[PDB]
Amino acid sequence: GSSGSSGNPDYVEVDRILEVAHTKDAETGEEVTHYLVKWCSLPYEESTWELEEDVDPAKVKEFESLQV
Structure with a gap:
């Protein structure tokens, strides 16, 4: 992790799982x-696929619920 520099090193603002x-x-x-x-x-153009690890587990459960 960063010691402490203005501006987050990344945006963990995930909307959902495509x-x-x-x-x-x-x-x-x-x-x-x-x-x-x-x-x-x-x-969108910057659509990436973060490894299950990086991707919180909770968010995964929600996505599943949708699809049987």
Whole structure:
């Protein structure tokens, strides 16, 4: 973490989860599940997929509830 410099190092303002993708690393063989973080605050064009880790677990539950 940053010692203390004006302006946050990142915006954790997630709106919702668009879609989830399951990828498999081609180095060791570990399952890598990616979660498309939907943060309106940021421009769509900048749509990224933060690893399940970075993506809070709670938010994951909500998304699931929607899809049976």
